[PDB]
Amino acid sequence: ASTNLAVAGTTQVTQVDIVEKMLAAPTDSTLELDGYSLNLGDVVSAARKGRPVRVKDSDEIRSKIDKSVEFLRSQLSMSTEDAISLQKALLEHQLCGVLPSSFDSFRLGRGLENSLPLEVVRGAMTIRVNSLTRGHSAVRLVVLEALTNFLNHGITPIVPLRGTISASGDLSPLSYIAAAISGHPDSKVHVVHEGKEKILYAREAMALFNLEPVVLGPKEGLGLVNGTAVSASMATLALHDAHMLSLLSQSLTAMTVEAMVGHAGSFHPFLHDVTRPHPTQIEVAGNIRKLLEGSRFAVHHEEEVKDEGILRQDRYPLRTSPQWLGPLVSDLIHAHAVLTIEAGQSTTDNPLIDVENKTSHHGGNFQAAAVANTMEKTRLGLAQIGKLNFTQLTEMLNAGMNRGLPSCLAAEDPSLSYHCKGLDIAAAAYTSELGHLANPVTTHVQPAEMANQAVNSLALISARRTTESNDVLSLLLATHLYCVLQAIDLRAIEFEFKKQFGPAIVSLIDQHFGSAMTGSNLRDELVEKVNKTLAKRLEQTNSYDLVPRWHDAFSFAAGTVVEVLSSTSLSLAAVNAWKVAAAESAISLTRQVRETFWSAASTSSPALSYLSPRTQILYAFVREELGVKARRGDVFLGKQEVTIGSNVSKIYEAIKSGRINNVLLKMLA
Amino acid sequence: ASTNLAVTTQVTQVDIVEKMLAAPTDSTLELDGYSLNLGDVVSAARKGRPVRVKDSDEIRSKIDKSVEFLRSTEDAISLQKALLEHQLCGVLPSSFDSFRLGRGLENSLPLEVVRGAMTIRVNSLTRGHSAVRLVVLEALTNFLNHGITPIVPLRGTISASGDLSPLSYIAAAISGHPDSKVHVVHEGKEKILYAREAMALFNLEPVVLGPKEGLGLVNGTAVSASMATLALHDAHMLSLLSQSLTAMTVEAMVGHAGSFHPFLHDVTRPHPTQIEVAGNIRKLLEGSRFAVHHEEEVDEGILRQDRYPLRTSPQWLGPLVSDLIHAHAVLTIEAGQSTTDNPLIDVENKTSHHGGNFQAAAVANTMEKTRLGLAQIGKLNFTQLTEMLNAGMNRGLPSCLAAEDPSLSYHCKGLDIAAAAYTSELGHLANPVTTHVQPAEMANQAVNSLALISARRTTESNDVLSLLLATHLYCVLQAIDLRAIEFEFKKQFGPAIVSLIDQHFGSAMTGSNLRDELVEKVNKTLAKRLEQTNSYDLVPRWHDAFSFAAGTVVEVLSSTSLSLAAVNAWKVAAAESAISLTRQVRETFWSAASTSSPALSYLSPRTQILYAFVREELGVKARRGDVFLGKQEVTIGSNVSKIYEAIKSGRINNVLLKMLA
Amino acid sequence: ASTNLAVAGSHLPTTQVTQVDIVEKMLAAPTDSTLELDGYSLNLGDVVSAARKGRPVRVKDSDEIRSKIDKSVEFLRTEDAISLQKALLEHQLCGVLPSSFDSFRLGRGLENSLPLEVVRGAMTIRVNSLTRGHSAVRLVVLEALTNFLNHGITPIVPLRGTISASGDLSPLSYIAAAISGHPDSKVHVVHEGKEKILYAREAMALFNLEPVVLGPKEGLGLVNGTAVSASMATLALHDAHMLSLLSQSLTAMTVEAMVGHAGSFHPFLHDVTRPHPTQIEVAGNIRKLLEGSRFAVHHEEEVDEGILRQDRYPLRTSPQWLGPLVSDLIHAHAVLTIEAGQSTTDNPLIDVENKTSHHGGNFQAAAVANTMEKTRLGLAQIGKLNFTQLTEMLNAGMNRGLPSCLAAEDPSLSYHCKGLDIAAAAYTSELGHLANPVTTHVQPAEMANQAVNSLALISARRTTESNDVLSLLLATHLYCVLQAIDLRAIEFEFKKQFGPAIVSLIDQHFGSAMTGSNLRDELVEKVNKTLAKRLEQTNSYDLVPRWHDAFSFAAGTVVEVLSSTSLSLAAVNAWKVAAAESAISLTRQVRETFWSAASTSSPALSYLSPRTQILYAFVREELGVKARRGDVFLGKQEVTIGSNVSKIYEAIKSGRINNVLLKML
């Protein structure tokens, strides 16, 4: 068992360290199970990535396994049909869950909703083997090999989704696994054969692979069916996914600060390391600080240090992000430590055999409360991440709050383009759904089995709900990522415009008013005050169409001219002429800057000029590798383009598949 | 709109259910904006019923005059396209490459929901308040009638300007948006195609949306109302099945029909739905020879009265049944008699009105209450079941409802566990969704109903309760068979007790008044003991019972000349008699078809209907036990699944109706 | 800050620290010597000592601390600033409190105010957090708060109104307004032997205190922050740790009352096979408590009728159930230690060394809310466990022959603990509902500037209520288990005397008939087995019919074993009657012997483990809560069961039980 905290789940280990180690798990080389070494990255590799799995090729391991079986046998001989019958009675009553009776009920894209996901089953078989290699259980090596042969030949039992309370542990689903390797006549398994997914009787599948059904002996029924492997499996997958979504939340925080031209100062070490040293608060601030280095969108503390109700500081979704995310990150790191012991270093069947002291012990290690605990806490965390990113996104999509970004992140006139409005509403919906999911399952314990099982963990049910919260959070975070990238591109257009328009203002002022200001000290003042009036006004006319927007801005500026140049000989006609020429100039320049953006490939986006080098990684991933482009607008284009949803879907799919995972790692390196 | 409450003691859930199940499925549903009822909605959504706007000049004129009022061009077309563009923002699979056996469409709304939504949407627009053209309404009925169903994301709506996003998918489909997909059955198989491809296959033309038609189509509550209607329909059936299971559990437990006597409800605590539930159960128990009847009934800590899961069942179910009846009234107005888009046009008074009829709180309200009610039904039936599966509590039913020696048969033990698991799941599902409202859309939508999310949760609760009630039905039928075997045994064993007493002890009792006393007292001793040893294997069980009875013989026959050897010999003979008779009665049960089950001799005539439905039509038999049989039979779960499927498909629905009227 | 994990808690599971270690350190906090605040050393035990036990508090007497505070003020650097601070308080003094004493009634009136202990803990943490030199709040302002603490002047603060972001703004503003002598500020003081609520200036004049006038940054310095939430959370976590330990003590004592198996706690089943550090801890605590018990069945001894041979899950899975929630409590301890003792939580914050200020979010109390959400779910989990233990023990069908309802005399007229069985269900149900999260109910507060807000204080209030309800439940369990233990002791004393009586009666009635045979040993063995099995199931019978039933069954055994003898049925019936009569009379005698003696001579003391005897004596002797014989048997309506459970509840709430728990473990 590893003492490296990056494996095992304090400032001496971080979520990024944990993720890096998980993502480094081999997928090609064989996972050798020894009862103690198995880690959560390994579990995910076997469950999801088809990694080969075997009991460690070791005389010590074999001898430990064999000696527990022998102990039981010899104890029995000193104290076989009926033992075989007892195991059959154990399976009989536990094969009691609901599955489709026939293929006749299957429909396109539907039909296996009442069965456990194949990956969960694979993860369960892996953990089950590991937990029996420890020598406490008296299950034969040939039985463990039956499981590893199922794994290595891609035979995955079809197991009901529901029916366990996760005490004598995950009895029912583990009984389906045991029935499958033993060739129960009514056991079904999933295989790929001749290029097709098939569901076959267990004996048919085994015959394709020349595998022999096992016949369960003394203690092997309880050895296989008592335990926590199914909930631990699903919980491990859910925690893996939650870690990624936590890192993505941090990344989206950074990109939002950039789109909002907000303050990187929120993440300064003084505000965390020095003043409020919660290790995971320090961690999160440091990740976001790292991501914002080099940004030309975010405002930097080290540069900053050089009667209107003016909002000068960022609102809480950005400014309190480390303080909001830190606590839940600590919970995810704690959960990692718990599940590592549970999945990798625990014997969870019963009774358990102490061969050295010739004793069989009656305990409770199948009570999966440690697993349920991780899932309750993680699901609440997912809801908290979701609330944060929703509040960041909805601020950014609010024209009144978003520091002058176009209404709805529309690229063209907002009168006929509401681009991200639907997504604002979707984000709300996902967030609401997360809130209800977050209520605990573990307060709903029933007096099961004649109250023998009066306390039961409900870990698998909890794991299921947390897996659904992962899914909903992925929809929300895919949505946010879609939006922030649009905002980044629109901000970059604003920056390109300002490069050209700053000089244009000065020039028009000189052309129109220079002679009237000759011999005065009015020019500096005028340029300064006209710029300030334009800036302040434009921030608030971000829902106006282009033409009236610019006439409005310069109308306001003309009032500033009246004041600043009130001593001069200028006619009202001359000031109005300046106003009109300046507005026309701004309107033309805007159109030209937009055309320069849209007429070139996304690989030439001006955003690449301003993004942090680290946040550019994620930008490039979505825009180039995923093909998700900025959206100019169906009405402007006179074309109903592939939908916003179709594009968000591509982001979501990259989250769910884990394609985005190495991207997050590279950014946070 | 119907004033019949089946569309207060004046209208019951059975009445409502009867009316729903009587909805035609073949004849065209004609939509007139007022008449549409929930059974109609279900028939269109699930049973493929043809749908049309009612063929009438009065309806057409109403529709055409609203359009004309509004009229009395390119930019209007563009505006509808901008409305759709931003609402087409939900997540669906990007390619078939992601589909897998049994999987793939989890991120889309069920097809029946989408059909129900189209049906409600058309109805709501026939009312003449919306300025959507008849040709647009006919585009929707044409999709319904050709089985063209838009593929619509599962998630994204908050159910205020109502169900905007999913309605926008429907609108984009009939308008042939280039990225709209639809499901159809064509050339005998399910396909997902682009909308224009699909329309070409059935010779339909896309509509081009004009002024107000984008909001007329996308603003409103049809999607949430559809899903909720389907959920309520299913919740009504589960409610009735709960009552049927209550009655059958009273029978299995040889419990008291007296709990359901009108004095206890109609007279003393007249909550209308309590009276209703008690009356349903009372009707089901009439004629049972398993349940004990009030009109026949009239220092050891014994339980004589039934525990609460049975005795308080009308008081427990009554309140939730009232909620379901209320929900029915609300959804009937929402689904059948409401205009939910905005702004709305008053043609008679020549005015437009800016309102909020898209705020689907009436729908959410139904779904939150229903989901709490499903948890309450589930808790009831779980408590009844787990009592019945507890050997210490179940009035002498075999442990785990094993048919043969329990040492090697734990029959329903896994189902006891499963039932707990289902119940726990229902409890968590029953927390409100509606308290998680977020400040959506720049706080323009700062209150939003979350009706569709609620409806989805309630739909999942229906599914979990279906698993639980299938489980309970499976178990109760096994218990009924075991109780019938007990009763057949008793028929032969009463006379055996007497004959053995006479054979072994007759001579010693001659001239005395001891025989009646001994028979009575030995019967009492045996009955009291056997109730407690229902976990013993057959052979030790009977020796145990007669060993206790031998103590009674010692007391009652203390004056006699009998040797201890004589009393022991009786004890042995009587135990061997009982063991053999038990084996005989079991053989007689197992060697005949279930159509001759002795359960049929004792079940009420109404509960017999459900017994026969499962045992004969679904083919789910009593289970004798894998070890006894030397065979690993088709699993318990396989058989429960057959029952669950009959519940989900609605096949059970007419059975329930038959039993209850 | 202490690197001692017993002070610090731990963010991960570790065998290097335990809940007992953490409790021991908390209970060792001085109550008399002055707590010196230095910005770093303050621990959770210290906070409770100041909040609840009146410990004096001062800013540490050091030039370094003084200079540090003074230098931040000077760095930051007037009628205008005074006005600004008053504007800040004005809008935050917006909560609800009773307008007058006219609304007060006996036992009621201050429900809409924060408990005084919470406000004292808050002031203590506030002053800590500002001694760190990042805030530019003057020492004289910190001394104003320490003077309030040391003179027992406690601001009356509304219970509700904060979302615990710019942190606990409203309640912290009430505290600020009080030390600055706001004309509408009320405070609580004890003066001339009575509790008084006075205006802040009135109270200050009693103690010769001068109001402070708030300067630049001092408004935000005082009102921005997490001290109120952290205070209430600290108190709730302290109480939860005690309830966690009590749960484990109750587990042990229920094993004893149930004559259950000590084997569930053997280290092979934890340390070796499933080494979650806190599972190991909990099993070790219960193992230690059971050592030497003569009620619990031991393993260095212990090693076709559906007989249950192993303990049910409430006892057998107790370490696996409690372990996870104990790890959460330890984690919460580490989190709150930093938040309460080592954190600056106002804003903006001043970096004097680099001559700059920083705009951050350290008032966002999510760390505190996090602890309270997990703790409240943990309390529900402890409750569910102890409820299931208790209700099994109170179930005659499941409790291995304990009298029905733990009635000491005939059950037909005594239902002793049945009401408590129902009450335990009620408490458990209430805990379940309390355990739903508060943190999922965040509103877009303050023009969405505060669009995320921690809701720590609300959460802490709910966790506090859960501690109260769990205290009711555990008081109830404790009451019941002590009765069960006395009843089991009575059974044991009976069995000691009845075993010989059985042999004697067999010899008397059957000796002659068995002469020349080997039947005697078999008869005794099988009669004993018959009696034992039957009696386990007849625990709801009244005494007289119980014994006739038991010996009627045993007579059946006699018929079999002595089937070859010459005995008449009259002879066997006569034995049955004499034997029942003997058992009945012996039971009455054994009962009288128990009830006639003092509880300091209870026979329970012959069988209880030496550690569990400690809790038994605390309740029976120190609290004076005795076993209950029965109102009907006694012919009198004694002081109620509820009155007695209330004494136990009071001992839990006051903390009097805490040193007892420590001593046992």
Side-chain angles (χ1 to χ4, degrees), chain C residues 56-165 167-226:
Chain C
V57 178
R58 227 51 197 160
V59 174
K60 189 183 174 59
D61 194 17
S62 103
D63 288 335
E64 178 191 294
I65 291 170
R66 208 174 287 124
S67 172
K68 176 200 295 206
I69 288 165
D70 298 3
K71 283 165 173 169
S72 60
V73 166
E74 230 43 53
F75 170 74
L76 188 117
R77 295 163 266 91
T78 94
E79 148 175 25
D80 70 299
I82 287 171
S83 281
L84 177 54
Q85 318 312 308
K86 291 176 176 173
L88 291 177
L89 305 187
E90 180 185 24
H91 78 276
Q92 287 296 333
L93 301 166
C94 62
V96 169
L97 289 163
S99 65
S100 167
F101 284 117
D102 292 3
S103 52
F104 287 40
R105 296 292 185 271
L106 181 56
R108 313 278 190 177
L110 274 171
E111 295 92 343
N112 286 325
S113 72
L114 278 176
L116 301 174
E117 67 172 36
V118 173
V119 177
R120 280 184 57 84
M123 295 195 283
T124 297
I125 296 172
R126 173 82 287 174
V127 170
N128 207 69
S129 66
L130 299 166
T131 70
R132 294 159 56 75
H134 308 136
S135 306
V137 174
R138 291 170 298 156
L139 185 67
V140 67
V141 174
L142 306 192
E143 292 178 328
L145 294 165
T146 62
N147 284 339
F148 270 32
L149 281 165
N150 297 334
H151 290 296
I153 298 170
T154 311
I156 297 297
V157 179
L159 178 66
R160 298 183 171 104
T162 184
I163 61 183
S164 306
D168 300 314
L169 292 170
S170 188
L172 288 168
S173 297
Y174 281 82
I175 290 161
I179 65 174
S180 62
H182 190 294
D184 196 28
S185 167
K186 289 220 273 164
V187 310
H188 175 278
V189 302
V190 171
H191 175 257
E192 294 169 326
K194 64 173 75 143
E195 295 185 77
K196 298 191 214 291
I197 295 163
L198 306 172
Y199 287 104
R201 282 170 179 273
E202 297 185 303
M204 285 187 332
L206 287 171
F207 302 94
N208 207 343
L209 299 183
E210 292 298 331
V212 297
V213 177
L214 304 185
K217 177 61 207 294
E218 294 191 329
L220 290 177
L222 291 169
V223 310
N224 271 357
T226 69

Side-chain angles (χ1 to χ4, degrees), chain B residues 400-474:
Chain B
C400 299
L401 310 182
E404 297 286 338
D405 271 354
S407 63
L408 288 174
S409 181
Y410 320 117
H411 188 190
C412 294
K413 185 182 287 306
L415 288 179
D416 195 20
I417 293 165
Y422 302 145
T423 304
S424 293
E425 189 163 342
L426 290 164
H428 170 270
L429 275 156
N431 294 312
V433 160
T434 58
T435 52
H436 291 284
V437 175
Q438 303 298 312
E441 199 230 316
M442 298 181 54
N444 178 56
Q445 312 197 25
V447 283
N448 52 81
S449 75
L450 296 182
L452 188 62
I453 303 164
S454 191
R456 286 169 47 228
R457 296 308 187 218
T458 302
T459 302
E460 182 164 4
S461 293
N462 278 332
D463 192 33
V464 176
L465 183 56
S466 298
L467 292 167
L468 175 59
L469 300 191
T471 294
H472 187 175
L473 181 47
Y474 175 91

